[PDB]
C-alpha cells in the first residue's frame, strides 16, 4: 500500500519487449510515439534496435533516431532510468528483473495476450494510464527477490531471481536426493523430483503447480515446496525472509542435480557444490492498476481459476 | 528474540481435573517458592479437593496469592507464566490475557505438542536459566476478532473456524478483505488462522506449515465445493470482514479456538485483524530448531 | 451398455417443494399421455394445491396413477423413471427403491449436475428415443449400509456416500475402521466418508478424493480433515465389507448421515457395516458413459479448464 | 484367489540384481535349499557370468547343476513354473519385463526395506518356500498396462507391458509439455505441465503416489491418470475403467517434443505424429502374498509409506 512518489519528475523510461514477436511491433512504436510526444528519453535494448522491422520502416521519424541505447555494457548506473515499461507476458518482467541486478526502477508492465500475473495494466487506452503513472501517483508492490550464490568446489556465482529457484534432476532418471539446511541446521532431506525455493511473487508461478499455497506478494516470507516428494507427509513450508537456506547434495548421493533460476541458466550441481539462498535487499517495485489486494485477487480469478463457482 | 531479566512474580497454569498433573505442579511450586518466586494460581486451583487437602503441601499452599482477572494490574504484577499440560493450557492462558501477555514457559507431560517445547525433566535448571534471562522468545501473533450482531471482542491464538455447527446444509459465506468482496466460500466452512495455528486444525484442512515468525494471516477452506480453492495467505495488516451471503437460507456457527461456539445469522459480521498484543513463548534452544523439531515429532512431517 | 424393452408404464418424480417445475411437469405428463403411456406419481404431488387447481390438466391429472411407496412391490409396475430437478431428485428416487431400480432418465432445469445428463429442451425426441430402447445406461453401484445399535438393525441403501462426523456435538471424532474383520485404521478428525464411484464427484470430492468413473467397481474411503498429514484417500475392492465403530477409548458419540438425510447418533457398541449393494441404479446417459461423465466434469466442477 | 497347481511345481526361476553383493549368501542358501528339495533352478546368463557366483568351491556342485534361462522360447514352452525374486521392487519390475506374455506366480523376498511388491521376508525362508510349493498361498493378480508406441517417420511400432506406470514428461529438455489425452477416440483433455502418469493400481503407491494420486488396492480393475505438476489448480487425478483405450499424443500446436518412460527404463522421445496407446494387458502378474491381499496391502502401506500413522 505504497504510493509512487517521485523525488524528481521522471524523464527517462526504459522500454523492454519480447523479441521475435511480430504482434508486439505495432504497439511498441505507438508507445514510443507517445513517449517522444511527451518529451522523454526512451531507452531500448540494442538487441532489438537492430531488428530489420524496427529500423527499416517509415516509423523512423524523430523516435527511432532518438532511441538511446540501454547501458547494457557492464552496469553503468541504475539512476539513468526512472521507470520501466514492459510489453508482453511475465517472461518480459522476469527478463527485466534479470537485467537489473541492483536497485530496480519501478516497473509498469503491459499485457497483450493473456492477463498474466506480473502484467496488471492493459494496453487499451495506454496514454491515460501512462500520464497518470507519470504525473500522478500509483500504488506499487515491492516484490521481494531471492539472492542466490552457487559455490563449486571454489568458484562462486551470484544470481537474483524473482519467481523461484528449482533444484531438480536433469537427464538423470533417479529421483534427486538433496539436503536442505536452514541457518546452518539440517532442516530436512528432499527425496523426489525436486525442491522449489520461491518468493511470494513466485507462489502463483510453477510453485503453485506443486501444491504451494497462494501468498500475497506483500507477505515477507520464503516458500519451500517439494516437487513430487517421495513421502506423503511432506507439506510445503513457509519460512521467515531473514533466514539463509543452504541446499547441498547428500554425502551418499550417487548422481548430480540441476538448478534453474526462473527457468533459465540451468546448471549442474555436483558433490561439494552448495546453493545459498537469502532474501535480496533490492526488491522489484511493480506498479499496480488500482491497489495490490484487488489486483492480486483479480489476477487469481483470471490468470488462475481460484474459487470459481 | 532474547528476553530481559526476571523479577519475583510467577503465574502457574495447569489443566484442571487431571490427577497426573498433581505431583509435578506442587513440586514445581516447591522449587518456585524455594528461592525467591511468588506463585499465582487460579481461584479454582485452590478449590481442588486434593491440592488443599495435602498436609505436606499445606505449608506451601499458604503463600498462594490468587490470580484474579480484574484489570491491567494483574498483568503488571506477573513477570512470566508457566504452563503444565498440552497446548490447550497455553490456549487457556492466552484467553486469560486479552491485553499484554507475559512470556509463557510451557511444559509438556504427555505429547510434545507445538506450544509446549520444554520438558519437565530437569526442570530446575531450565527454570533457573529462564530466571537468569537467557532464553529465546517467539512473538506469536494473535487475531483480534470482533463479532457485531451488541458487539463482542475476542483474542484468538490458534484460529477462528466458521462452519455449519449444530446445523447442516452448508451455506454460503462472503469474505471481505479491506472492504472488497474477494471470494464466497461454499463447503464445510472457512478457517482464519495465525501462523501459530498453521499446524493446528488449519493443517488438517490442507494448509501449509508456516513458521510463527512470518507476519501473515491464513485463509483455509474446510472442504470447499470447488476444486481450485487453494488456501491463501494475506498480509497481517489487512482487515478481514466475514458476513453471511445475502441469499443464504440457514445460519452459520463461529468458534474461537474451539470454544465459545456462537451462531451467526443475517446482519452479523465478523471482523478479523492482527492483534497488537502478541503472545511471547519461551524457546528451548532457538525458534527455527524448536519449530522444526516439533514439526518432525508431532506431525511426522517428512518423516520418510 | 445398451438395453431395450422399456414400454408402457413410467414413473415421474419431481421436487416436492413448489418451484418452476410445474410447467415442465405438466408438459411432460401431457406428452406421455399422448404417447399412450401410464404415468405414476407420488401421493404428495397430487395433494399439491397448484397441480390440482387448474382446468388445463383435467383428464391428465385424473389419469395420474398414485405410486405406493411400499404397499405394492413395484417390480413390473414401473418400467421407467423420469426425474425432474437436480441430483437431489435422483437421490430421492434411489431412496424410494430399496430393491431393483428401473432405468432412470433425469432432466436438469438449473445446473447440469452429474446425475442429470438430459436437457429438458426438445424432450419429446429424447423420450421417444428412450422408449424405442436406443440409449446407453450406466449401472451406478450403491452401498448397502446396516446400523446395529445396543439389537435393532437398519437396512439403508445409499447412492452418493455415507458420512460419519462429529454431528451436532463439537468434539472431533475418533473412530475405527475394519475391513473383513481386520482393523484398517483409526480415523481422527472431522470424520470419514465411504462413497461409491458415483459419489466421487459428490461431497467426497470436496475432501480431496480422486474423480472415479462410475464404471469402476470400487469403494472409496476419504477422511474429512484428518489429524495426520499422511492420511490419503484410499480405494478398496467392491467386494469388501467395511465396519466402522467408535473406538473403545472414545469419550463421546459420533453421527452418521446417509446422503445427508438420516443424521443419527452412533454410540459405544453401535456398528456400521457397509457393503456393495446388488441392486445398482441404472442411470440413462445422453451419448455414452465416458463422454457424458467428462462433459459433466467439465461443466459442473470446472476441471482442467484453461 | 489361491494357488492351484495342475501338477506339483518342479522348475523355478530365481531373479536377483546383478549389481549388489549382499545377495550372494541368500542366493546361495536359497539355491541349495531348492536343490535339496528336488527342484530345477533357472538363472539368467549374467548370473552365471558373475565372477563371484561361479568362483565358489562350495557352490560349484549346484552351479554346475544350474540351468540357464534363455530370454526367448520361454513363452512358447512354459518351462518356468514358479518365480522367486531377491531384492527390492526393481527386481520384480525386471521380472515382469522379462515375461511379456503369461507370467508364472512370483514370490518376492526383501532383504532391505519391506517395499510393496516384496511381501515375504527372508528369515525362515525354508518353511515359507515349502508352504508355497504345494500349500494354498493367496495371490494377487496385479493388472499390467499394454503400451504400444506408434512412431511416424510406414511407421515403426513397438510394444511394451508395464507394471508400475508409464510417465510422459518434458524429458531432458524444455520447460513445459502439452499432450492431448483421448479415450476411445474422444479427446479427454490437454495435459499442460510437467507431465502425466498412466498407472495401474499396483503403481498407485509408486511414483503416481508422489504426484497426489490415491492409494488403490491392486484388486480394483482400473487405470489411473495423474498429472505431474499440472498448470491448473483444478486438475485432479482420474480413475477410469480398465477396458478403455487411452491415446496420448503431442498437441498439434506443440513446439517441443516430449519423453516417455516405462517403469523408469527405455526413456524414448515422442515427436509430432507419434502416439501412445495404453490398454489393459490381459496378462496380469500373479504376486504371492504372505497372509491375505487386504492385510498384506495395508501392512505394506503402513510400513513402507507411513500411511496414517499417529
Swiss-Prot record, chain B:
One GO molecular-function entry: ATP binding
Catalytic activities: NAD(+) + ATP = ADP + NADP(+) + H(+)
Temperature impact on function: Optimum temperature is 55 degrees Celsius.
Entry EC no(s): 2.7.1.23
This protein's UniProt keywords: ATP-binding, Kinase, Metal-binding, NAD, NADP, Nucleotide-binding, Phosphoprotein, Transferase
Enzyme class label: transferase
Cofactors demanded by this protein: a divalent metal cation
Any GO CC annotation of this UniProt entry: cytosol
Example GO biological process: NAD metabolic process
Organs and tissues of expression: Widely expressed but not detected in skeletal muscle.
pH and activity: Optimum pH is 7.5.
Protein family according to the UniProt entry: Belongs to the NAD kinase family.
Record's protein name: NAD kinase
Organism name: Homo sapiens
Residues of the full protein shown: 98 to 430 of 446
Amino acid at each position: 500500500s505504497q504510493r509512487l512518489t517521485w523525488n524528481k519528475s521522471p524523464k527517462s523510461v526504459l522500454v523492454i519487449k519480447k523479441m521475435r514477436d511480430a504482434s508486439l511491433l505495432q504497439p511498441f512504436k505507438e508507445l514510443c510515439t507517445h513517449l517522444m510526444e511527451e518529451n522523454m528519453i526512451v531507452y531500448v535494448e540494442k538487441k532489438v534496435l537492430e531488428d530489420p522491422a524496427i529500423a527499416s520502416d517509415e516509423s523512423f521519424g524523430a523516435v527511432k533516431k532518438k532511441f538511446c541505447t540501454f547501458r547494457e555494457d557492464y552496469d553503468d548506473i541504475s539512476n539513468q532510468i526512472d521507470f520501466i515499461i514492459c510489453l508482453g507476458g511475465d517472461g518480459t518482467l522476469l527478463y527485466a528483473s534479470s537485467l537489473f541486478q541492483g536497485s530496480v526502477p519501478p516497473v509498469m508492465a503491459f499485457h497483450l495476450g493473456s492477463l498474466g500475473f506480473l502484467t496488471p495494466f492493459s494496453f487499451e487506452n495506454f496514454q491515460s494510464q501512462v500520464t497518470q503513472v507519470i504525473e500522478g501517483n500509483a500504488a506499487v508492490v515491492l516484490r521481494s527477490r531471492l539472492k542466490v550464490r552457487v559455490v563449486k568446489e571454489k568458484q562462486a556465482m551470484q544470481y537474483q531471481v524473482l519467481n523461484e529457484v528449482v533444484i531438480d534432476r536433469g537427464p538423470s532418471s533417479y529421483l534427486s536426493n538433496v539436503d536442505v539446511y536452514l541457518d546452518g541446521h539440517l532442516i530436512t532431506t528432499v527425496q523426489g523430483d525436486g525442491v522449489i525455493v520461491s518468493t511470494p511473487t513466485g507462489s502463483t508461478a510453477y510453485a503453485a503447480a506443486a501444491g504451494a499455497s497462494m501468498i500475497h506478494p506483500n507477505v515477507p516470507a520464503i516458500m519451500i515446496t517439494p516437487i513430487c516428494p517421495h513421502s506423503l507427509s511432506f507439506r510445503p513450508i513457509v519460512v521467515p525472509a531473514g533466514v539463509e537456506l543452504k541446499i547441498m547434495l547428500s554425502p551418499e548421493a550417487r548422481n548430480t542435480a540441476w538448478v534453474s533460476f526462473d527457468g533459465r541458466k540451468r546448471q549442474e550441481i555436483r558433490h561439494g557444490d552448495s546453493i545459498s539462498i537469502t532474501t535480496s535487499c533490492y526488491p522489484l517495485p511493480s506498479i499496480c492498476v488500482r491497489d495490490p489486494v484487488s489486483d492480486w485477487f483479480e489476477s487469481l480469478a483470471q490468470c488462475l481459476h481460484w474459487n470459481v463457482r
